[PDB]
Write a protein that binds this ligand. Structure first.
Ligand code: HEM
Ligand code: HEM
Ligand SMILES: Cc1cc(N)nc(CCc2cncc(CCCN(C)C)c2)c1
Ligand SMILES: Cc1cc(N)nc(CCc2cncc(CCCN(C)C)c2)c1
Ligand SMILES: C[C@H](O)[C@H](O)[C@H]1CNc2nc(N)[nH]c(=O)c2N1
Ligand SMILES: C[C@H](O)[C@H](O)[C@H]1CNc2nc(N)[nH]c(=O)c2N1
Ligand SMILES: [Cl-]
Ligand SMILES: [Cl-]
Ligand SMILES: [Zn+2]
Lengths: 403, 405
């Protein structure tokens, strides 16, 4: 029937009835679970999604059945029947953006979901205008290190017309230059975007942390290249509270995590450019970005500096170096007065969020493999909590690369 | 592309397709509408015969005699036996193949690289609780081997029509007592509170330590379980010390050498073996992270962090992470010093990636439960974190079964 959901540390049980509201298939079947896969393998419809969303909106303002609610439904209907599409009012877009964050199964930061600044950028007609909105978004969100969550929404997709797109996967990305002796200098995750930039006329650097320009694209136009003003990109030098040699590693990370390659779907409408930002959880930087073998891969370097036995796995040299790197990220962001949350505090807030949502909506869609942090899993409460994963709309979705 | 799940490793960029999942004949808990992958326990002769035939086919394939005269004859013999008695019996070599294949098929086990080297003790002649005990002690002595641990399974008689099961009530052959206290706390292992109280109900005189080895409650068919004390010399333990933190030894922590699971059901060709205890050797995180640091287990994290003089008043000091690493190191160092087989989570996961490649070639895939395969500390520092996995049920299988009481 409905999933019985148990927490194995406390022995407490809930039941998810929210999943019954899902209208979209995930990748699992009774024959086999594909829950660990990162990406998906691959007018009456629009109208029914539209109506459902308008229903969500009016219920949320506690005015279901009001004349305003009936009129709005007819507007949507008349617009679709005539034009094949429709448009949201700003207040609907604001509600929609918040629900999409709220519904995002892979996000451990959802306790913050109702606090989101929404910039309406739907009156955008050029890449140059896109750039101006983006600079303002960054300036607002960064806020001298007192980070504020925000989203900017660019014009929706229209049939038989190219999309508005930001080609970069994030607003801030460090270059990855592939030197022909096999290796990569910089961030291996951004090799393809770096090359795309150079090809579109960017003068490349040759450092480990060169901030990339943005490639911005208006419909059916070649993308345009814009360099972000260095004073807009707040960055944090990494040092360690006790290990003085750590700063000599020349490591740093940027303050603002702003994803810019995802599609925002609201009521059947699709926003192909809608970058969103919040603040970092430390493990993203300290564990994944710096310690992944296919990223900066600094584990061995830090270990050799800590004079650890690199010869055998059984000395746990990797685990020790990783802890210290995460410590340095936390220490450095704290010294710089830049908002950051550690994985213990984040997962503790998520448990509170699960409980809030259980009372509010009867469940919470969550992807266990993503919610549990990449170091010290079972040391956090979420490890011991069963979760149900399913797709609710409004939603953030992946979409193909524009190139 | 091919019409099978596509499986990617995000570290290496390499891609495989799982075709083995096509052979699954039993559903798990997921649907296209919602994934239940994270749940720990998810919820007639014609039915027996098809399970039986499938297994005999599997057996004859494994010896490259599929379609042979002996194959058709063994099939014919299984149908005849089921037809006249409602059940059938496995030849010795079929039981051995079945036991190894159940291990090979176990989605939650990271140690499967070793699957082909499993010593199978045939105990289907056992007729008493006392005899079960003799078999179990023999298993323990062989598997323990003075610290040079050897994988083994002992198989007691199958479930039979209208007759009680053979059962071992304890969840493992070695378990530390958990004594419920007057204030509500637990002395010992909280995981074992219930089995401890059952032992006392059945006549065990209880100790009062943190590490009292429990007696075994053993049940022969249609009889009350009998109580058996393991002679201490048979139960190898390892006192825990740390290679540099000299005070760690003073904590008086220890763990037993042999992980031997005893409450699972071994299913083969529809036959059900309700008592089939199996053992290997530990991965160090099972002891160092889960058993010692889980909040609902021994919960020693704060004790150790205080000894290490860490800031336990704030999450951002990473005092939990720091203490947990040193505890795992102590586990590894103590087992190594004691010459008792053990594998760290890095070596174990590397060996499992090797296993995945072997099985891709041998069977076109490998059923695996990501959440269980990725270790409870240092997750993304191990190669399995970045490997997509397909989970599904194959038979022969080890299955959960309800508690006997
Ligand atoms: C405010 C503090 C926030 C924290 C601490 C946080 C934390 C996280 C973390 C750790 C991840 C995993 C990312 C990865 O491993 O690659 C994630 C993913 C995600 N977050 Fe949040 N987040 C925050 C704000 C937001 C906001 C404002 C939004 C949208 C409005 C959002 C939506 C998402 C989405 C859609 C993903 C999945 C990304 C993907 O699948 O590629 N988050 N978050
Ligand atoms: C040889 C060394 C072995 C190692 C290092 C190993 C490792 C592990 C680990 C770390 C787990 C996770 C347990 C947990 O978190 O509760 C596990 C589970 C499991 N193992 Fe292995 N194992 C080994 C041998 C065996 C053998 C010999 C068998 C059977 C013949 C086996 C069958 C299983 C099964 C069925 C589970 C799942 C149990 C459950 O879900 O309660 N393993 N193993
Ligand atoms: C709003 C927000 C806040 C935050 N702390 N992290 C994020 C995600 C940032 C992030 C971190 N590592 C990696 C990625 C890339 C993910 C790519 N997808 C396709 C798996 C993104 C977003
Ligand atoms: C053969 C074998 C080897 C090994 N290293 N571990 C095991 C599992 C032992 C084990 C460890 N922690 C916890 C448990 C309890 C299992 C809980 N199941 C029933 C959900 C069992 C078995
Ligand atoms: C294969 C596996 O699904 C994949 O590597 C996932 C695991 N969990 C994750 N969790 C987070 N937060 N971010 C990730 O990129 C991943 N990667
Ligand atoms: C809720 C979650 O499924 C549960 O805590 C699981 C997670 N992964 C695990 N993995 C292993 N090896 N052992 C476990 O007990 C668990 N517990
Ligand atoms: Cl990032
Ligand atoms: Cl154990
Ligand atoms: Zn699933």
């Amino acid at each position: 029937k409905f999933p019985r959901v148990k927490n194995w540390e406390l022995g407490s049980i809930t039941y998810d009835t929210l999943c019954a509201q899902s209208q979209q298939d995930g990748p699992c079947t009774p024959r086999r679970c594909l829950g660990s896969l990162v990406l998906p393998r691959k007018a009456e419809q629009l109208l029914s999604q539209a109506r459902d969303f308008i229903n969500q909106y009016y219920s949320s303002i506690k005015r279901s059945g009001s004349q305003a609610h009936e009129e709005r439904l007819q507007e949507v209907e008349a617009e679709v029947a005539s034009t094949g599409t429709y448009h949201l009012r700003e207040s609907e877009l604001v509600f929609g953006a918040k629900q999409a964050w709220r519904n995002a199964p892979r996000c451990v930061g959802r306790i913050q979901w109702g606090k989101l600044q929404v910039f309406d950028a739907r009156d955008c007609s050029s890449a140059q205008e896109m750039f101006t909105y983006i600079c303002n978004h960054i300036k607002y969100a960064t806020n001298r290190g007192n980070l504020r969550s925000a989203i900017t929404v660019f014009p929706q997709r229209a049939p038989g017309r190219g999309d508005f797109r930001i080609w970069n996967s994030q607003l801030v990305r460090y270059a990855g230059y592939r030197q022909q002796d096999g290796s990569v200098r910089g961030d291996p995750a951004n090799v393809e975007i770096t090359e795309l930039c150079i090809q579109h006329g960017w003068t490349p650097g040759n450092g480990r942390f060169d901030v990339l320009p943005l490639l911005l694209q208006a419909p059916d136009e070649a993308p345009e290249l814009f360099v972000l003003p260095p004073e807009l990109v707040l960055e944090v030098p990494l040092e360690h509270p006790t290990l003085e040699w750590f700063a000599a590693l020349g490591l740093r990370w940027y303050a603002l995590p702003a994803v810019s390659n995802m599609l925002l779907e609201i009521g059947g409408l699709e926003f192909s450019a809608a970058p969103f930002s919040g603040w970092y959880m430390s493990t993203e930087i300290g564990t994944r970005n710096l310690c992944d073998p296919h990223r900066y891969n600094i584990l061995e370097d830090v270990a050799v500096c800590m004079d650890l036995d690199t010869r055998t796995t059984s000395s746990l040299w990797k685990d020790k170096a990783a802890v210290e790197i995460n410590l340095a990220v936390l220490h450095s962001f704290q010294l710089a007065k830049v908002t950051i949350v550690d994985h213990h505090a984040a997962t503790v807030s998520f448990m509170k969020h699960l409980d809030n949502e259980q009372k509010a909506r009867g469940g919470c869609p969550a992807d266990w493999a993503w919610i549990v942090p990449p170091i010290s899993g079972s040391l956090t409460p979420v490890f011991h909590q069963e979760m149900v994963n399913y797709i609710l709309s409004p939603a953030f979705r992946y979409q193909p690369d524009p190139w």
